[PDB]
Amino acid sequence: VVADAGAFLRHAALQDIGKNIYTIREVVTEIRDKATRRRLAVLPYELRFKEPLPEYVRLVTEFSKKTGDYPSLSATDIQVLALTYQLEAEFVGVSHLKQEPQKVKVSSSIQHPETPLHISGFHLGGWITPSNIKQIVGCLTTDFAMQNVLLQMGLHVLAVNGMLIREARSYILRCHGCFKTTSDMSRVFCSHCGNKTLKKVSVTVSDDGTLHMHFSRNPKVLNPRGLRYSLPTPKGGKYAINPHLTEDQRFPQLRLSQKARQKTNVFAPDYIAGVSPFVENDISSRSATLQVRDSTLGAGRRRLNPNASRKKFVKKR
Amino acid sequence: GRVRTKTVKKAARVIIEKYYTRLGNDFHTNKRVCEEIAIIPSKKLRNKIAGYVTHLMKRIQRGPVRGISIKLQEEERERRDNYVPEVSALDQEIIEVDPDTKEMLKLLDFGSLSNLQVTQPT
Amino acid sequence: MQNDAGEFVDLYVPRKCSASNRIIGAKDHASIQMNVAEVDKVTGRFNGQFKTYAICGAIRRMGESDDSILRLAKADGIVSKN
Amino acid sequence: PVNYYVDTAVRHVLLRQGVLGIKVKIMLPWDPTGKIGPKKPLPDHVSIVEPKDEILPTTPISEQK
Amino acid sequence: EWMPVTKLGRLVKDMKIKSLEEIYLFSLPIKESEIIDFFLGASLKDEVLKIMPVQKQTRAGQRTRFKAFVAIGDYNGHVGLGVKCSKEVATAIRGAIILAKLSIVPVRRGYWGNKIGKPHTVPCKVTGRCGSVLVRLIPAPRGTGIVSAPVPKKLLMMAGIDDCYTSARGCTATLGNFAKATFDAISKTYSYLTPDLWKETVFTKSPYQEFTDHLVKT
Amino acid sequence: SGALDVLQMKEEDVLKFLAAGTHLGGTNLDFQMEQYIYKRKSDGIYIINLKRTWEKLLLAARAIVAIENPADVSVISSRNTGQRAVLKFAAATGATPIAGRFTPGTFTNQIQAAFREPRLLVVTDPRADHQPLTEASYVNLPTIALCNTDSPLRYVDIAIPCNNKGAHSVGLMWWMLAREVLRMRGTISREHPWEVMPDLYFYRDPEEIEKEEQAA
RNA sequence: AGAUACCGUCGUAGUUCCGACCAUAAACGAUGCCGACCGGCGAUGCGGCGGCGUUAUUCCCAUGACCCGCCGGGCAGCUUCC
Ligand SMILES: [Zn+2]
């Protein structure tokens, strides 16, 4: 019953049924949420601190590149899966394991990648019915890069859901250029070839590790259309904005002012005294005069192709 | 508040650069070696210098900070830069290759390479 | 250049561009003198010989000094055909 | 160190239309007084000893005089 | 005693760059004014073309500073032009003297009619431009002198141009524009291909590529 | 390439460019680079003619050779993908590298202690470090730029059509550049493949140090 | 403080159609017309040319609808030390 930082981030206080609870000292000190340290204050006296052996760690990393997750995992995420390996070699039959499991078995569909495959309020009924937010030996990990490596060994684990795992539904990113799948959903640029040729790939992993992956065979994604356009001169200075080609070229430090970057925490009832019922807009600083915006704001205009019919009075960033 | 100064900062880094080997993590031994080399004015200044040297030694013992250029730490760095693993990632068996990449080397008379894999075109 | 008696009445002979044959001016600083080295045809080591080229700045402004040097070494056999 | 580096001199020179008055300040250098400057250097200046080059031994040779 | 900060100045100082001409041949920039003092030396004269007062519109009024248009020239070989704006009028002059030595073009001299003796006039009819100031040099017969405004006559005299026909157009009253444009036009005499210059250019070893053995030394 | 089979692209080396994916080009292609391409395919990945890429490496592998003092070469990465290549390039070269931030005015401002006067410049990127390109436009410096499909050839002198968006894509270019210029100068010759492994010139990515110290 | 003005309620001529007048506009790209030459890059409108594919219930060719490329003339962009 190996404990993970995501189990305390969702606060899965389940030290009651699984009683062989071992964990890493590092993955609880790296958590920056204070309610997890509040969880660390009282309950975890039933678990035990333990590290895995360097013989065990390297054998985890062998089929980790063979399941294509070794750059997708963190460094502390490596040792937790090797911490399960000593527990499985100790308690459970090693004779029921496998490694180098299985091929891709591409299930090409005519389903668009951005379709709401099992997003909860989305329906094609399925309501919310306000009980189901909490209804949305082993381990308790909510990271799929952690969950992928487990079930390919054939290691049934559980979650905050007390039942065991059988279905693993998530999304990965395959490079359309160099055919390299990463389990990370956050990055938008590739890890092997470095282009923006990552595309959304849905997976479905069973407990045995039946990797079958819906590669979306649909030419709206397989498209060269909005992909060629001339770029301005490379500009160097304090306020230059080069159009975000690589994942790490040195942008100049452009930041929002902290009186503009913060929104309203309008939930909090310590709220009445003073100013207007909204956040004050920043009209004073030179963060506002240089028109510095959020990197998340305006992302729909990035998806618009450059050579199009923009209205004759717009200018973006 | 209590912010250090260029006279504190820029002069302490020179002691790191030239005489790192005699330095240590003490305030009170960095300070006693500071007067051996730095021809200083008054003692408040050399105390702030020695404190920034001690803080900077603490910062170094994690990893190299930007301000330093050490004759001893960079040879240590090059002998930690030379991480030479067993198998480099350019000696591999199977590398999946698009069919439009395949036709190039058949025309550029390298179609005899067998490490490739033409995949199902998506 | 040469007077009636034939003395060379000039200070220096300004070099010409090796691409577009224009005079490289004396205060021209995007100008290039690229001393490209020669190989052995057998060993692949250094000959002792080297072919000096020259690119004027307005060519270098246009992004076209790449192909220019590229076809100049085509012209000297330093670039193989295709 | 304004009180032992600069030298203030103030005068009253006369002309037909009135008085001009001049001011001359001479900030003295270092290198103690051979008529030139003070003993004590600048209290901002931090002179560090030049990097003294030392011989590195490899083999334990005991040079016994 | 002068201690250079460039690879150029060392080879100038240490008898490795023979003349001024090899710097012009490979079009190397000169960043040290003492190199000009090395070759020209005595054979170099300077002129103030104007001192004008200018004013910075400060938040508390104005404050007075001075521009200094200094044209220098090797009589028979070379010209230059420097424009320094300082607060002190003696400072602005000696700034622009250095600044003109950093701006030494050579000039090409030709013949009007037949080529007897030494050249005296412009080789062809070159032009120059600086900000609505057209300035046109024109070749002229031997002994006609410079037929110009007083301002380009300075640069043409200090070049060694004995005689020329000048024509100008624009707001020539603005001195800096009108003095750079005639400095522009005399700069272009060596930047003009004439049929004498069709001999293919044997690229000699640049002193960087030649005397780099002495540059590893110091 | 000088049409030598001694200098021809050998059969092992084609694998590495395929391995890292330098043949995979960018999404944009410069028309000045459109000479060097092999073909457009579907989804805008302009596959680069690698034999043409190989021919441009060798001209750069002749350009650096003629300089007597190997210290007279500046080698620059402005970003954090070609840091470790450029540093240990000059360790195997004798070049004079610049890693990380290029100080604006390194080549112009003759007062600086950082002021160096090289005779030849090699750039990792004509878009990331474009600042030492315009610096090289003033001091009469020839220029080599590891040009992607989207790479403006402005103020370049010779240019190499590879990919450089990828981490390993960059490091193999510098390793194999250094692999030829040394065998051009007179170290161990064409027979032995070189003792330095190209994983040394890959970018470190120090999240992988904690992924390599915890296993090896 | 001042209002015959910034306001509102009605409201003629007019705004509408037909037949004649009338010929001015910040009638603007504040940029004559025809022709040649001079950097790129995609998007779009019309016509044509070529083509693996998917749907019109497939299929038989049609023909549309999309998709990739090319040519020509357009309204427009964007780019760039021409
Ligand atoms: Zn990729």
Residue numbers in the entry:
A (entry chain y): 7 to 130, 206 to 217, 232 to 412
B (entry chain R): 2 to 123
C (entry chain V): 1 to 82
D (entry chain D): 163 to 227
E (entry chain C): 59 to 276
F (entry chain A): 2 to 217
Anything the authors wrote about it?
Hence, the final maturation step releasing functional 40S ribosomal subunits, namely processing of the 18S ribosomal RNA 3′ end, is safeguarded by the protein DIM2, which both interacts with the endoribonuclease NOB1 and masks the rRNA cleavage site. Here, we have used cryo-EM to solve the structures of human pre-40S particles trapped with a catalytically inactive form of RIO1 in this final maturation stage. Image analysis revealed two distinct structural states, prior and after 18S rRNA cleavage. We conclude that states A and B of the pre-40S particles here isolated with RIO1(kd)-StHA correspond to two very late maturation stages, just before and right after cleavage of the 18S rRNA 3′ end.
In the pre-cleavage state, DIM2 and NOB1 are still in place, while the postion of RIO1 is not clearly defined and RPS26 is absent. State A harbored an rRNA scaffold closely resembling that of the mature 18S rRNA. On the head region, the three-way junction formed by rRNA helices h34, h35, and h38 is fully formed, while RPS3, RPS10, and RPS12 occupy their final position. Like in many other pre-40S structures, the upper part of rRNA h44, located on the intersubunit side, appears detached from the body. Low-pass filtering of the cryo-EM map of state A also revealed the presence of TSR1 in this region. On the platform region, the cryo-EM density map allowed to unambiguously position nucleotide A1870, belonging to the ITS1 after the 3′ end of the mature 18S rRNA. In this state, DIM2 protects this region of the 18S-E pre-rRNA and impedes endonucleolytic cleavage by NOB1, located right next to DIM2. These results suggest that RIO1(kd)-StHA pre-40S particles in structural state A are in an immature state in which the rRNA scaffold harbors a quasi-mature conformation, but the remaining nucleotides of the ITS1 have not yet been cleaved off by NOB1. Furthermore, NOB1 and DIM2 are the only two RBFs that can clearly be distinguished, while RIO1(kd)-StHA, the protein used as purification bait, cannot be clearly positioned on this cryo-EM map. The absence of a clear density for RIO1 in pre-cleavage state A suggests that RIO1 is initially flexibly associated, while DIM2 and NOB1 are stably bound.
